[model samples]
Target chain A: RPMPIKVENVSFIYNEGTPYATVALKDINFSIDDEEFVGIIGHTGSGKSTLIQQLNGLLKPSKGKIYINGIDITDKKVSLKDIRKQVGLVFQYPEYQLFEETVFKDIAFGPSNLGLSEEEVKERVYEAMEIVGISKELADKSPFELSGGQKRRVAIAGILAMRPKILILDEPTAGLDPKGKQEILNKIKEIHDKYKMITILVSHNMEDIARIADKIIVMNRGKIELIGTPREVFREAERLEKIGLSVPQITSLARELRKRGVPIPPDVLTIEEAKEHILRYLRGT
Target chain B: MPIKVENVSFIYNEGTPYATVALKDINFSIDDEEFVGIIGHTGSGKSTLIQQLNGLLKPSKGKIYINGIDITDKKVSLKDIRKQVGLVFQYPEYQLFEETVFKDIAFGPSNLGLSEEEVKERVYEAMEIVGISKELADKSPFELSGGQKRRVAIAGILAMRPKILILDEPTAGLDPKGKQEILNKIKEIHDKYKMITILVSHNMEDIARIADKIIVMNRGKIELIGTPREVFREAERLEKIGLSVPQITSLARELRKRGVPIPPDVLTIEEAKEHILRYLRGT
Candidate 1:
């Protein structure tokens, strides 16, 4: 039931005709197909936020068309309700996602709006809770009482209960400690594979993007700088550094070692990959 | 000047009894420090403990000595303590209210009731230290970028010329790029000014990089105090309190466990590379 989402010549200008006018996004075009896990990487003013907002129709392009599942979302006849329900967008932090007195009520919020039966709503909420690894005892407890990682899980559950086909998360692990970051990202990856959802992850960590993404979209100065798989994009290390970004530390380390005549791969993206290569070479295998 | 804490304890409310002991006997001293990191979870006494260093909070038991003078003395001037200490809150930019960036940075020094020329000199010196461009002095502080606004806020504090700087998790909401930018500035200022710097944060990695000594707090007590390696090696206690060592250190431990012979306490990329490369090439 999934179709490719396409953006054709999209351009958006903020505060047009005013002195403070800025071209937030310009001439941006990309197509995402089935079972894709795409990463959007850029600094603050790189038009990353603006583009994600357009995917859910929160912001409409001034210049081009966005088609999701063969339907032009920008058309006047199309109900935004359908698009919003299908494409779930998670913000930088879960602080905004949580407000209800209890976790059960919060996950039930989105499904409750669908006019489902009370029993059906509870069933969806329970399934969502289970998917997010939330214990039953924690459901009645207030979300404010939960830890940083647990709070994010409840937030992700709030979206999952909506049955969103396409999941988009913006810096979902921004403030978590190292352990919590790994756990949340793994949970997201598991969900993506099991459902074959079109997942878009926006983050600042190059290492994180390299680890999980099927492909990456690099944005700079309101344009798509490059779009490719992790190894392909990170191989342009100097170019990425020129544009205020970096490859993973291990990637940079491997390149540095290669320069010293150790001959590691030009595109080692992770500690695990670097470990295996180093072990093999050290043991003369 | 040196800081010495002698059995200092802080209570929420005393005597008529809604009393609660917020901080237990904290006995530690930073005698002419470079950078010290304080780590603890929320509702811990890290904030209140720093407040004790300056005259912001009064201790219920024992005494805190700043430069051999009992700061707890009733006769001691609070202004004298505040002049020597500057605390940058978590969101320092929010406190900027002046119209222009120049005026905002000048607010603290100008309040000293000095002449315009002296105040202007102090303001420029402060701006120079924190890397704020003089071109933006005339612009509104609110109009500058987030990074610029943050630097301008810290510049305002520097104008006061405090010898002791305490920043309470100033890198909370910033991206990784901004995180490095501010911490690098902080390290630079610490070296240049020869001042004691206290950084309270949850980031174990940042602490391991910049801190000369680290004080670990758990449940309102000074649980552990040592250099980065000393404190981080107690990973059992730290992880129990929702804390851990730096990632590379953990990896070094992992590699060591796999008979890789990498040192278990490796902390930096360069250190990790040195050991990793040395053994790999069999040199």
Candidate 2:
């Protein structure tokens, strides 16, 4: 069975105590259950990052509540230490967080923080490193000695070592080559499949979300504007465009095809979906 | 005048333990009026090669010539070469730390010792080239939007009036619409200025649309150099080198494998659309 996350009337403001307070998020409510992959997207300052940070206790909502597994996280009864173990948040360009002298030490940081036995920490570190596709030889070298792509994976391994129940990634593939982007995504999917953990990815690339996310959430200004499967969310691309976002290239292509009198499904989200529909139409069906 | 590299090589931190060959025996040339796109993965020597053209980094071996003048010769002043070849670094907007747009744009021309009126004239002309209105001239550069600030930073370099302009990933970190806007502005500026433009980008789509010639770099060497159609046609070879052709071109190539009549060299969505439509109408 799946455990549900709950948020009720959540709102946030930066620098709230002083006169320079800036309202970041407002009246947000959503939930993600176990074994589901969700994506959150918005314009550059749409408060998407702020809301995700609140899920893991990185930020406290100015007003409202967050519950994990039926326990209100904001209440005095809930233990934040337990919450931290359940949620792992990777910031944008998280690769910059690598400060350890060696990749092994970097990956081991989280497990050690969790007070795992030394042998267990070492085991988890190697497993986490493998999940992100880093080699043992490379893990022995200084984190700075690796290439840009390898450095990013090492940072991801650091977060994965804790074996958190919920992993939230911010722009996981930012600043990567095309192949690097695909490889990292495939790794994330492989982990999700093996662990069946709830994962939330925040990204600007619509194509990426279409490929991996089971559900899509769009935020604008300070609130959730749309939420659904990739097909349901991207099919309404004009609405996405109103919020300064766009759908995948294939979705746009399908829309363009529809405009020219071809009745391709408006709900088509992926290139494979478009190809399947076009083939069926061409078969004289 | 064109820029040519004859067997250039560079080893960063030479003579130190950390020294590594960044570029090896690279040879290529940019024609006087050509729009060339240099594509490569990080640490693949694309940036190293482009920097040598503007005299920003000296080649450890071989020589670079501009208009057939040996740039590495002791008699030549690097400042003179930089004046003729303007290079805009990645995220050039970060270079904009000026009070007003006018002051920022004038920085380059004034540095060249142009008179006040001449500098102001170039500033306005450069702003027009970048499609920035005069209404924005007096505003603080910091106050402008991210896209607008980027255009202003680019104009600052254009105002220098270099015969050849080079941009390194000028469209990074922008929305799709913003990317198109900046790419279109670059196209207009290149046409009006009639300058040899070298755009180094990781985005294959941008290069396919704008570049007259495409140069692929890998592991510190020139892997291929050809027109966009000529280079991107070999999509498999590109994918092997940690790069891929534009997504649409790859799709067209895949359909060709599946026995579609789509032409192999169609690189953009509009071109592919036309080709598919033509084929469908005939059938």
Candidate 3:
């Protein structure tokens, strides 16, 4: 079963009492349910990364408490190993961390660390590889011999082998090409659907988030700016643009059409939505 | 002066087990004062090709001629060639180590052996060109924000006063406003200086907005080269090669497929908006 995440009045401070002291996140409070697809969007230094890092216990909050499955992670007695086993975090460019000699061994490293049986480790490795669409033939090859996209897949498979209940990905498609971006995102969607994993995606691309995110979290300057559905959040296009972020291009066009006295909703997030709204506007009441 | 390349090819780690052909049989030319945008997926040899333009990478085959001078020739003065071509790499702020923004901008000009007064004048001029006010000159470059630091890096290049400027992914990983601010400054620089500008980017919308000609590369080979409108018209081929057309162009294509009377060559939001308004009026 997937676990629930609860963050209460969290405040993270770096280098406290020093000249470089900075407040990375402040007064953050939110609850994520099981099997929810949460997409977090923010500009650079907007506390999105800090917030996710706190979820997996990579960073502790200077104030407030975090709970995974109702177990307070802030407690000194809590086992971070257990918390991490349930929450898998994939940092940006995870491929750079690939150091194993073979693809199968690299992916099995995570499962093997869990103290599972040898047979179980092998099963998990092949299952994770299958989930990421890595062919069995390439399992014996060195990870360095793979292409950029394939190497990234192998890295992601390393995390999937653990089968964590809550999976967090930070900027998974920052530098990939268009096809690569689409492929990785589709695979993520498939993983979320099949495993019922509580998936959190951090991205700068609004279009990608709008397509797959069940809920949206907008952060700005160490605060939760907006948290709602894609349409509900995107309706405040002006507010989002006021910060360094932007709405999807289709949403922007819908706003332009609405400004010209066309009876179209500005919250449209897709080209199909825009077309339907425009067609309805033309085919008057 | 036009820049020409006659059948250029580059190989990495030749005669070794890991030898790879990074670029192959590349041929193109850019006229003076032209704004060219290069687009390619990662590992598509865009970096290798641009490094060759400034003689930073020597092609294993063929020659590069800058202003009718064969820069590939051993006797050619590489110093003079570098002086004519200023390259601003990605995340250039990491290259800034001077105490103040003024000193950092002056580094390139002072390296030319110019007088202190001349270097100071060039530093101020470059600062103004990149819109860095004088008040910020005495401050450290590290004190500035991400956008401001990027401007300082660009100012360092402009201080050299080169005839050819090349920027590799100037707007990667920036916020929306920061990306717009840097692109606008680059466009203004191109307009004011009339120097040959080569911009390498992965964002199709940005390339559509600024580039006069677009070069598409795939797997160490040139796939297509044409104006934005002409290049975007081959959307199917580009998609096959792991690239995409501009969002507006994709919208136009989808609308056409839905039986809307939109033109196929629409590459900008304004053009698409105009066509939609026109079609609605006619109906």
Candidate 4:
């Protein structure tokens, strides 16, 4: 019934307070309300990766605190295993982590490690695999033997086995072709819908972030740039472009159309909406 | 000078429990000085097909001919094929194992038994092609940015002086500036070398901008093969296979659907802009 996560002034420097230390994340602060679909975006080396890793408690913050369900997780008494279980983080190109022999075992890794009964682990793995759209036939094959898209699906399934209420994905659709990307994105949306789970997605594609993210967060140089609904953030397309994050093509078109003596509104979020704006303009809306 | 594939087929882990027929009777060709873009969903045999061109993976059936040399022939050394048909694999930076950038650039030509002086000349030449400076030659490639590592990897392939260059997602993991620089570098190299360039990518914008010819693959087969304009004109085919046309094409289509009188041939941003401008100004 409460928010799943909240970050209060978290800052991290890799190998910190040393000569080789580089400040990776700045005073990052945010929260994910339960069942909220959020997208995180930033330029390369902008700490999007590190910020998500911190959320999953993989890398503890050197400054400030992170709270899961309003509980200060940095407290030495907090169990990392419990935090990881509650927050399943899938790294980019998750297939690279599929070292297990069979898809079944790989998917079971998270659930089995939770000390669930053998039958329960099996059930969770099966359910996880199904959520990511993996079929029974694919579950028996070696993850290495699967296609890149299938491998990614299975890797995401491994995390899903834990059934974390808050699913954190780092570029889940990276390295995929157009078709593979759409399929994965749609499946993610489907899963979010079915479970009403809080989903945190980090991606470079602005259109992708605009499409599915009910709320969007922008990070730049270890600082929060902006956080709002997709329409609200992308409304300032020029500002976003200046920050090295290109506006979605649809938004660009909308902006360009406004500049070229068209009455179409700025900040058109999707191709569908842009279509409507154009149609309405032509029809005297 | 065209590369041709005739009824080519390939099987991975052949005759084993994990055996997979990666390709089936794949027939295609690209003439000299052509810019071809290859697109396919993952494991649609896109990578498998590129490997066949340079003899990295031989066809289990039929033949592949690069400039009339049957690459599958035992007499024809794959070393020669590799030299003449440069290939940069996906995330090719992992393949950069040499001590320094200079040695890495020279590795391809040196493997061809080129003299030290000749290799040095080609090394500089290759670095130039990928827009890397000679100063970087002494530095380790590992210290470079992800984008720079990609350029160095491409430089390694270019040092061989190939008549055909193949790159699989050469712009992967790069920022917009990095991606644009790599794309521009490829364009420059293609012009200077007069080589047939084959780009395998998922980025529609890059393909739309550079490709003289476009080939779309789906389910391990060529779905559509045409010039950029011709290929993009059929947005239905592209969307049917789970890909939208390039942004410009989509924009034009949307305008047309909105009762604007623009021809469907609009495929590029400039074209779309021109169409909208003309309609709005009644020019």
Candidate 5:
């Protein structure tokens, strides 16, 4: 089993004691089990980014503690490099971070930094490329020369080569075409299924998150608003709307239908489920 | 009368190895007070086309005429062109500056040599148009939420009183309610002002709901130009170009594929509901 992460009363304060001091995260308490697919949803500046940055020791909490695999990462004696080797973060617009001349070198950068042998690095690079559906022919080309989708895959490959146990993707499908979005989400699902790694997706798209995430974490103003299964969280759709968030379109439609006295479940997240419910309702008792 | 484009083409880095034809032989005329939605895959020249209209980037060939005046002509001033067309870019909140939201919105109008009272009046009027409350008038723009900041940015644009409003993915990165609010505000502005509004969006649903006409671009070319119904009818053609129709339209297509008698052009939930209910009752 992969390592479980525990956060106890975590609070992150940016520029503490200064005029610009801001509470990015406030007393966050949550535990993610091994290989859990968690979706983080919130409005902009709701501390989703801050919370993820804390996962791999990129940001230190001003108060409270975090534990991974029962080891206290907040302890001064723990090595952050080792923690990072187990937790990989793919930030928003990660394609802009590509700097290597070729795709192979880019994906190999992480493994090579781990001091793997050249042969091992080669194996990891090709394997990572294949996992993300990056063609072998494009491996020799500059990352900048590829299309937007290819560049995104190359960036993901860079992270995948590290082979972290916990993968956090923040807005991975942002600004992509519908086709590109589908392909990336599918690749993410494939990675999660094949490796059983803990996958945390941060997205503004509720439909995408509802389709993939087993558990959803809702944040608002640096605090956890709600956390539950997709159906359970979407049950509070009206509350989510009040906080400037929304459930999936399917769920909203179902709720509207329910309000209109249709005998259909209100928490349906997928179009197929909604369609089935509506069809059954239309077919009579 | 509105804007006219005659055989427009835009080439990026014309002579270098990185040379690209961003737009190729584009032709379209948008009437005044019309709402036009533009859809395309990444790098399909949607952004290039919008920028060219405002003279931010000159077309390599052909001409754009706003009320019979050539925007590309040397005699025509760019300031005049910009005054006639207001372009709100993606993530426009990043453009917000000045201390208070009011001051930020007033920045554009003040530049036009309006009196201080006139600038203030325009600022408040624009804020009202975007549904921004008066309580936020003196608050720092930086302190507002993402949706509020966007409203401030749009208010700044509206304060300019441009005859044409262009939005490039204005609701990108926003949640569903946020997206709805932004699009609603855009529709309200379009209806209230009767300006030529051009919306470049990736969300086919939003475009279908708001657009009077739709333009589909592909590989630097105009793939289709028609109403939402007309454009969505070419679902196969759009799919070939890595694009798709709105969700309801696709659902309708799937239902038809599964032997349902629903029309393929159904774009909205109510329309789908009406058609499906009609089919069931008839059956």
Candidate 6:
């Protein structure tokens, strides 16, 4: 049976009573199948972060149900630990996530807790390090001695060591340079494809979302605005703007040129796509 | 007078054996009013250099002159320097300790000995500048979402009415819409007040779009400083140092490599669009 993660009618409110109540998420319904990459885009207050935490049982929904592999995680009787075993989350500011004396031990701690042998745990640690592009020579160094990017990769490596069925990353590439950002995205896709894990990436960048995601979930004002493939959703650039979102830079540029009677298509998503289309028009091909 | 830095240098953990250089021989002069963008990787001494501009940390060597006042003097008032420099920290939300958002934003202006009514006016004006609604004025900053807290924190700085505005990664965690709006507002406020604005960020596109001049730092030293095009044109060098030019700039280079005749220095979509149209239309 294929593993699946599904959310049905989830809503959450903050400060529920004492004069400052606010609905953080409402009427959310979505199902993510295995071996798929899902991109979640939302404005800051769109409650995407809250939703990410909910997937791993970090916060109980005020209403509704979420399921992983046919198990109801929202049930009070279900063990949060069991759900966490299948869902590993990496956050943008995962500062508190790293506390181990050495990088190897930090990545090994999760697999070690699974009652694995020492050799088995070391294999998982080394595998995660290789996948995350962390050099093995630095494994003995204190995680604290690493740079910010290095520390973050170590934190992600720890989660990857768990061998989770579902992985969620909250703006993992938020502050990285473009080169570093592309490298991280490639590694993420590599992990997702290799393990066939359902990877959900919450990103603020339209360009990255367009390039990497198989499906896009656009959220706004505590609600799911649209869910479709990148091509389908980005074509609704006008609608995205209503929710304070935008299409990728290339798409917007192509749209403007297309409107001005250029033969370019507005559905382009990447720089290469734009370049190819523009070359075609310029060359009369 | 303009803001001037003369061979400014800062050493972290000075006198302790583990001392390290955080900033080095930084010499740059800013006009009375202009927008300057500083770009560098996080570990590249960007933070130390920004701290020196606001007197948060005094350089161990050299001096900073702001409005003809030497800020490094032992007896000189750091208070006056701070009042003139409004710095929105990278994590400004952590500095929000007030219960209510309104009170937090008003706290800065209220200390100016302004009248209660005038202070209240400044509070609302500053709040709106950050796109925070008055309805949230009474909300607890801690209860508000992370983005709202950041808005309140920035409002606090805007309320101070400083002559020199500096924001470090102000739009780092914000969404696309909020990020663009916040940047535009920063530029607007900079112009409306005619204050010298300094922005430090990781987003190359944003720096290229809004910065009048860009300063590049590396290894506690000024690597290069120029306009957006000048800096980005060296995409080869930038990538060598773990930095990168904007996507459009890279796109142009890719086109050039593929035998397309697009200009290599296109820094923004607007520029890219014009160049493409000119090429395709045979203009």
lDDT, candidate 1, A134-166, per-residue tens: 898898999999986788889989888878878
What stretches of model 4 exceed 4 Å from their correct place?
A136-147, B13-21, B60-63
lDDT by residue for model 5 (A157-182), tens: 98888888899999998898767778
**What would the per-residue lDDT of candidate 4 be over residues B222-252, giving only the tens digit for each residue?**
7778998888888887877766677667767
Give stretches of model 6 more than 4 Å off: A1-3, A8-27, A60-65, A75-77, A101-105, A112-123, A135-141, B109-121, B133-139, B257-261
lDDT of 3 by residue, B166-185 (tens): 99989877767678888998
Residue lDDT tens for model 6, B157-252 = 878778998898888877888888888888988888899999998888889899888889888888998888899999988887768888888888
Q: Which CAPRI category fits model 2? A: acceptable
Q: What docking grade applies to model 4?
A: acceptable
The better candidate by TM-score, 2 or 4, is: 4
Q: Any idea what lDDT model 1 has?
A: 0.84
What lDDT score is found at residue B54 in candidate 1? 88
lDDT of 4 at B43: 69
Q: Which stretches of candidate 5 lie over 4 Å from their true place?
A: A1-3, A15-21, A112-122, A136-141, A283-285, B16-18, B96-117, B131-149, B256-262, B274-283
Looking at model 6 chain B, which ten-residue stretch has the lowest summed lDDT?
Answer: B274-283
Question: Which candidate should be chosen as best, given TM-score against the real structure?
Answer: 3
Candidate closer to the true structure by lDDT (higher is better), 2 or 3 = 3
Q: Of the true contacts between chains A and B, what fraction does model 3 have?
A: 0.45
Q: By the lDDT metric, which is better: model 5 or model 6? A: 5
Candidate 5, B8-32: lDDT as tens digits: 9999999889999999999999997
For candidate 6, the lDDT comes to 0.85
Alpha-carbon lDDT, every model: 0.84, 0.83, 0.86, 0.82, 0.87, 0.85
TM-score of chain B of each: 0.94, 0.95, 0.96, 0.94, 0.95, 0.94
* lDDT of candidate 2 over B10-99, digit per residue (tens): 999998999999999998888878899999876789889888888888899999988888887878787788778899888888773778
Name every residue pair that clashes in candidate 2: none
